[PDB]
Amino acid sequence: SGFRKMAFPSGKVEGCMVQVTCGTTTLNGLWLDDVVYCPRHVICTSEDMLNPNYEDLLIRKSNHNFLVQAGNVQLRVIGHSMQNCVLKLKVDTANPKTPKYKFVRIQPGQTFSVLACYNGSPSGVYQCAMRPNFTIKGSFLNGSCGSVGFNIDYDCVSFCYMHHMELPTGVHAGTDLEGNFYGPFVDRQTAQAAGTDTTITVNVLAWLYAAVINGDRWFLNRFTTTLNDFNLVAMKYNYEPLTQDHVDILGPLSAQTGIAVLDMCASLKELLQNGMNGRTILGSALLEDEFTPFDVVRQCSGVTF
Amino acid sequence: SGFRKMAFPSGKVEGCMVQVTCGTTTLNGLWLDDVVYCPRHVICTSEDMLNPNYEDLLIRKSNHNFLVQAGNVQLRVIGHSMQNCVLKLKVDTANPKTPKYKFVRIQPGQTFSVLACYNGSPSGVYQCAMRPNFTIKGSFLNGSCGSVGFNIDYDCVSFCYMHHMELPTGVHAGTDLEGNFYGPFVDRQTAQAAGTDTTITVNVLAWLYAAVINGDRWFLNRFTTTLNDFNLVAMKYNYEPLTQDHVDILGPLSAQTGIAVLDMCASLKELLQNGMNGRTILGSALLEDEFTPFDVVRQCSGVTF
Ligand code: NA
Ligand code: NA
Ligand code: NA
Ligand code: NA
Ligand code: NA
Ligand code: NA
Ligand SMILES: [Zn+2]
Ligand SMILES: [Zn+2]
C-alpha cells in the first residue's frame, strides 16, 4: 500500500535527448529515427524573441548552422524544416536507442512525466497535469526548452509535450510534437495570460478513491447528491463540471471500493464547503488533481513497462 | 522557475533490475557486475515469514534453486551467500548495462529516488526522504520487494536502499545494499513499531528558501529568533532540533536570498504557531520536508547527469 505521485521510468527518453545549437542559442532536442525535434526559437536571439518572423529568420539558416550533439557524438544534418513551432532536423544516422513511440495530443486534465534536461543531459523526472487552461506548473530553468513530456504503455513511449515558454506568471507552456501549442500561447516574449486555472474534478475523485483504498476514510460522510447539485457547488469552487463520461471512467474505482460515484461527490462537496479542518488525505492538506482514474488504477494493480 | 519534487532519471537503474524466484516466491533483484542482490526473504513461504530461521532455510537451497531472469534472458547462478538481510547470487555474466555505482548508507533526513518494480520490470519512479525514524512513506504493492533507492552524481549511481517490508502501520522499511536495515526493523512478519515520526527541520527551511527564490514570500515576517528559542518551539511541534551543522548547510541559500537562517527560523516559528490560515507555499498547504538543501541548490542551478 501507500500512494505516491510517480513518474514513468525515464530511461527510454534519456536515450533520445540531444543538444541543439544555432549560433549562440542552445536547447534540448529529441532524436527519434533520423529526425531531431526541437523548439524553433533555437534560431532566435533574446532580441528576436520580442517579435520574431520565424520564416525570415529560418531563411538565413542552412543545415550546417544546426549543431546537433548526442553525448560527445556530433550528428550530420542533411535537411531542416519548420512544422508549426518545431524544427525537424534530418540527420544521416537513425538513433539506435529509438524506442517504439507515438506522437499524441493529450486533453486538458491528462497527466504525463517530464524529463527536465539542460544541454541535452537529463536532470530529473516529475509527474504533472495539463491544466484545464493548457498550462503546466513545471520546474524549468534557462536551457530546459525542448524537454519533453511522455507516457509509457508496455514498451511504447507516447510523446505528448515539448517545453517552449515560461509565461510572465511563472507557469509553463509548450507544444505537442507536431509543434502545435497547447492553449492560445505563441512562441514570442509578449504578455500572454492563461484562463482561470480550474481544478480537475474527475482527478480529485479518483484520488479520494485512492485514499479509501489506503485506509484514509475520515472524509466519507452519510450523504449523497446529484450531478446537477454537485456541479452547482463545483462551478462555485472553480471545479470543472463533472459529466457522465467522468462517472463512467470512475466505475472500476466505484466497483473496488463499493462507494457509488455520487456518494463520493457528496464527500467532495462537504470538503469544498467545510475545507479539511486542518486534517490531511494521503499526506496532503489540499485536494490533489494530478492523478487520473487511469493513474490510480495503475498504482493499485501494479502495471510494469 | 517553478519547484517540483523531482526524482533522478531512472535509466541507469532500469538496466540493472532483474526477477529473482526461489520456489513460489518472486521479487526484484539488482544486477551489478556478476552479482545479483535481493531480499533474503525470497527463500521464504508466507508461513516462514511468521518466524524464519534464514540460516536453516537457506541451507536447503542450492545455486540451481535461484531462478534469475533479466528481460527474457535466464542467468546462470554459480554461487550464493547471505550478507545480513540480502542474498548475493554470483552469475557467470557481468551485467553489460552496469553503471558506475557505489553502495552508501544514508542518514535520516536524506532524500533518494525509488524505482518501483514488479517481476524485475520498472513501473515508476518517485522522490522520498528517509524519515528520522528510518521508515519511508512509499508506494509498494505485492512483489515490489528488492526495488531500490538511489542518488545519481554525474554518471555514478549511489544505491542507498532496498525495499523489504511494509510495517502493520503501512509505512515501508528496508536495508542498505549490505543488507543492514535502516532502523530497528527485522525481516519477520511480527508487530514492529517505528518511533515518533519527526519533521526534518533543515529540509523545511531549505524548501522555504526555494519558495522565496520562486516569489512565494508571504510568510516572510519582521521577526528573528535564536537557535535555543527556535528549538524550544521545534521540540513542541515534533521538529528535529536544528544544529549549527544545519545552519552551515543552509549558508549558500542564505547567501542567494539575503535572508539570514535565523530570520527564516522566525518565519518557520510563526507558521508553526499560527498554521497557514488556509494559504499555500509552492502549491502546498503543509510544510514540506522531503527537499534537502542540496536538492534545493541542485534544482535552482540545474545540475545534469
Ligand atoms: Na519555439
Ligand atoms: Na526530456
Ligand atoms: Na501550453
Ligand atoms: Na529480507
Ligand atoms: Na528498483
Ligand atoms: Na527501514
Ligand atoms: Zn527557450
Ligand atoms: Zn517481500
Selection from A39, A53, A54, A162 nearest residue A103 by Cα: A162
Element (H, E) at A30: strand A25-32
Nearest-5° angle of CA A165, CA A169, CA A174?
25
Cα B79 from Cα B90, distance rounded (Å):
5
Resolution reached, in Å?
1.8
- Alpha helices per DSSP H over B175-260: 201-213, 227-236, 244-249, 251-257
Distances (CA, A) of B268 to A4, B82, B281: 26, 46, 12
Cα A242 from Cα A202, distance rounded (Å):
7
Burial of A88 (0-12, 13-18, 19+ CB in 10 A): middle
**Core vs surface per residue B110-123: b (16+ CB within 10 A) or e:** bbbbbbbbbbbbbb
- For ligand 4, a single-atom ion, the residues with CB < 5 A are B 39-41, 85, 164, 187
Q: Where are the beta strands (DSSP E) in chain B?
A: 17-22, 25-32, 35-39, 66-70, 73-75, 77-83, 86-91, 100-103, 111-118, 121-129, 148-153, 156-166, 172-175
What technique determined this structure?
A: X-ray
Q: Taking a C-beta distance cutoff of 8 angstroms, is the pair A183, A194 a contact?
A: yes
| Kind of pairing between the strands at B148-153 and B121-129 | unpaired
Task: Determine the straight-line distance between the first and last CA of chain B, rounded to whole angstroms.
Answer: 20
Element (H, E) at B270: helix B261-274
Selection from B11, B153, B35 nearest residue B86 by Cα: B35
Residue in the block written with cell 494493480: A301
Q: Taking a C-beta distance cutoff of 8 angstroms, is the pair B247, B261 a contact?
A: yes
Q: Which domain holds residue B49?
A: 11-91
Contact A170 B1 (CB under 8 A): yes
Contact B302 A215 (CB under 8 A): no
Q: For chain B, how many helices (H) and strands (E)? A: 8, 13
CATH label of the domain that carries residue A245: 1.10.1840.10
Read off the C-alpha cell for A126. 516529475
Contact A124 B9 (CB under 8 A): yes
**Which 8-state DSSP code applies to residue B218?**
T
Q: Is A63 helix (H, G, I), strand (E, B) or coil?
A: helix
The dihedrals phi and psi of B82, each to the nearest 5 degrees, come to -105, 120
Cα A242 from Cα A222, distance rounded (Å):
21
Nearest-5° angle of CA A202, CA A126, CA A34?
110
Burial of A233 (0-12, 13-18, 19+ CB in 10 A): middle
Selection from A97, A83, A95 nearest residue A176 by Cα: A83
Read off the C-alpha cell for A213. 483504498
- HSE (side-chain half, CA atoms, 13 Å) at A128: 30
Burial of B228 (0-12, 13-18, 19+ CB in 10 A): exposed
Selected for mutation to probe chain B from A118, A123, A150 (highest B CB count within 10 Å) is: A123
Tell me which chain B residues have a C-beta less than 8 angstroms from the C-beta of A304: 117-119, 121-123
Selection from A104, A147, A130 nearest residue A292 by Cα: A130
The residues facing A38 across adjacent strands are A87
**Core vs surface per residue A244-272: b (16+ CB within 10 A) or e:** eebbebbebbbeebebebbbbbbbbbbbb
Q: Which one-letter amino acid corresponds to residue B154? A: Y
Dihedral angle over CA of B141, A157, A211, B210, nearest 10: 110
Selection from A116, A68, A157 nearest residue B3 by Cα: A116
Read off the C-alpha cell for B188. 519477520
Sheet holding B35-39, edge to edge: B73-75, B66-70, B17-22, B25-32, B35-39, B86-91, B77-83
Cα B190 from Cα A199, distance rounded (Å):
43
Task: Determine the straight-line distance between the first and last CA of chain A, rounded to whole angstroms.
Answer: 20
DSSP secondary structure of A168-214: TTS-EEEE-TTSPBSSS--SSSS--------B-HHHHHHHHHHHHHT
Q: Taking a C-beta distance cutoff of 8 angstroms, is the pair B175, B162 a contact?
A: yes
Neighbours of A280 (CB within 10 A): 14
Cα B246 from Cα B241, distance rounded (Å):
9
Contact B6 A143 (CB under 8 A): no
B143 in the Ramachandran plot: left (φ > 0), alpha (ψ -120 to 50) or beta? left
Tell me which chain B residues have a C-beta less than 8 angstroms from the C-beta of A143: 302
Percent of chain B that is helix, strand, coil (3-state, to 5): 25, 30, 45
Tell me which chain B residues have a C-beta less than 8 angstroms from the C-beta of A115: 9
Output the CA B6–ligand 5 centroid distance in Å: 16
Sign of the alpha-carbon dihedral angle for B138, B141, B147, B153: negative
DSSP secondary structure of A108-165: TT-EEEEEEEETTEEEEEEEEE--TTS-B-----TT-TT-EEEEEETTEEEEEEEEEE
**Which 8-state DSSP code applies to residue B239?**
B
Q: Taking a C-beta distance cutoff of 8 angstroms, is the pair A26, A119 a contact?
A: yes
Nearest-5° angle of CA A287, CA B291, CA B113?
90
Neighbours of B102 (CB within 10 A): 13
Cα A130 from Cα B33, distance rounded (Å):
41
Q: Taking a C-beta distance cutoff of 8 angstroms, is the pair B187, B39 a contact?
A: yes
The answer for residues whose C-beta is within 8 angstroms of residue A68's C-beta and 6 or more apart is A18, A19, A20, A29, A31, A36, A74, A75, A77, A89, A91
The residue count for chain A: 305
Neighbours of B223 (CB within 10 A): 12
Read off the C-alpha cell for A88. 525537424
Cα A149 from Cα A151, distance rounded (Å):
7
Q: Taking a C-beta distance cutoff of 8 angstroms, is the pair A167, A185 a contact?
A: yes
Element (H, E) at A75: strand A73-75
CATH label of the domain that carries residue B31: 2.40.10.10
Q: Taking a C-beta distance cutoff of 8 angstroms, is the pair A253, A206 a contact?
A: yes
